[PDB]
Amino acid sequence: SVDDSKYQCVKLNDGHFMPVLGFGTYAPAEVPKSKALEAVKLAIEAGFHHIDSAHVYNNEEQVGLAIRSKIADGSVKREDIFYTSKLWSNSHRPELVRPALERSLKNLQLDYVDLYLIHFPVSVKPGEEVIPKDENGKILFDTVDLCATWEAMEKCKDAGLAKSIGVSNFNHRLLEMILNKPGLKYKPVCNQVECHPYFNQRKLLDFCKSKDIVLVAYSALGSHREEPWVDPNSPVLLEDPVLCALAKKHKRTPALIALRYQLQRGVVVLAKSYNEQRIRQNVQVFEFQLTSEEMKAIDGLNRNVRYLTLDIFAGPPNYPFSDEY
């Protein structure tokens, strides 16, 4: 249609530009990986320019192939795709960071990722098991200085393997640990965290904005709800009457209201869908705007509901969700 050469982005603190709507690629293991290949191709056709994955999603072969397929048919150029990967917690030791990035890049068959994140701040012992456990099912925790992990991330950006580097699931204290590290070369460009109208992350968002860190929202639609990661008793975000009222007023959908909320408060928003219609629906976030009154109504929904506690990882001080923010 009218002008597909341009799209909305935000300038990161390292000078790179991030598209403000990202396509989420995680799906529960029961969904065939074929659907990831299909869905990324559809997302790129629909106008997503930012694609979010991770080693632990076990889909980088498919996601990379979808990107390469869309480049080879002329649909998009590599410069106009912003691809994120993440370093899993079995590779936090500094000597394991670049090996893990190179392994992701070999799976993707890409030369570089646009963004590499520390996925989660609790370290687990190295090896092929992504969640290694003892005989009673308790995680095997590892002891790693994330400031040393971050210096290994910085060397990946100097090597050109990652254009930008950031973090995910960090709280205030862990962000200050990085920002205050002696000899810091690059600040994180982003903190990717759960964020939606039931857990709007006000306080953490303000801190990130005070440092020119972009907050990137995952579970912006209320999450995948996969058991046993998400409590099935938790409220379903998109049933909320305020979201539904706003959707009816705008002739949009609750999902669109939840995405647009994030864009207007300065957050970069992810959205996963493997459904062709809903992929195309989600790019309609650029076709309407919420009034101040509507933003205030959504701010009023905040209610302390964290879908993704990751509490199997609790105990070490780097477990990020016990602090206020």
Ligand X SMILES: NC(=O)c1ccc[n+]([C@@H]2O[C@H](COP(=O)([O-])OP(=O)(O)OC[C@H]3O[C@@H](n4cnc5c(N)ncnc54)[C@H](OP(=O)(O)O)[C@@H]3O)[C@@H](O)[C@H]2O)c1
Ligand Y SMILES: C[C@]12CC[C@H](O)C[C@@H]1CC[C@@H]1[C@@H]2CC[C@]2(C)C(=O)CC[C@@H]12
322 is in an annotated binding site: no
Asked whether 113 and 286 are in contact (CB, 8 A), the reply is no
Distance in Å, CB of 125 to ligand X, minimum: 20
Distance in Å, CB of 112 to a second copy, minimum: 13
Q: Does 31 bind ligand 5SD (CB under 6 A)?
A: no
Q: Does 310 bind ligand 5SD (CB under 6 A)?
A: yes
Q: Does 192 bind ligand X (CB under 6 A)?
A: yes
Site string for ligand X, 139-178 (x = CB under 6 A): -----------------------------xx---------
284 is in an annotated binding site: no
Residues 282-301 that bind a second copy (CB under 8 A): 286-293
Q: How far is CA 171 from CA 78, 189, 318, in A?
A: 32, 15, 9
Which residue in 103, 202, 248, 303 binds a second copy (CB under 8 A)?
202
Among 324, 306, 325, 314, which residue's Cα sits nearest to residue 122?
314
Half-sphere exposure of residue 208: CA atoms within 13 angstroms, side-chain side = 30
281 is in an annotated binding site: yes
Distance in Å, CB of 126 to a second copy, minimum: 33
Q: How far is CA 257 from CA 56, 77, 196, 263, in A?
A: 29, 30, 11, 10
| Residue 7 is a catalytic residue | no
Which residue in 253, 260, 268, 313 binds ligand X (CB under 6 A)?
253
Residues 211-250 that bind ligand 5SD (CB under 6 A): 229
Q: How far apart are CA 112 and CA 101, in angstroms?
A: 9
Q: How far apart are CA 128 and CA 142, in angstroms?
A: 14
φ and ψ of 12, to 5 deg: -80, 170
Q: How far apart are CA 267 and CA 109, in angstroms?
A: 30
Among 217, 215, 117, which residue's Cα sits nearest to residue 172?
215
Asked whether 63 and 108 are in contact (CB, 8 A), the reply is yes
Which residue in 15, 29, 182, 232 binds ligand 5SD (CB under 6 A)?
29
Q: Does 229 bind ligand Y (CB under 6 A)?
A: yes
Distance in Å, CB of 26 to ligand Y, minimum: 6
315 is in an annotated binding site: no
7 is in an annotated binding site: no
Tokens describing residue 242: 């305020």
Full DSSP string of 261-318: HHHHTT-EEEEE--SHHHHHHHGGGGS----HHHHHHHHTT-----S---GGG-SSTT
Torsion of CA 189, 194, 200, 201, to 10 degrees: -50
Residues 196-235 that bind ligand X (CB under 6 A): 218-224
Residues 114-143 that bind ligand 5SD (CB under 6 A): 120, 130-131
User: Which C-beta is closer to ligand X: that of 253 or that of 318?
Assistant: 253
Distance in Å, CB of 5 to a second copy, minimum: 7
Catalytic residues: 57
Q: What residues make contact with ligand Y under the rule CB under 6 A?
A: 26, 56-57, 130-131, 229, 308
Q: What residues make contact with ligand X under the rule CB under 6 A?
A: 24-26, 52, 119, 168-169, 192, 218-224, 238, 253, 255, 270-275, 278, 281-282, 308
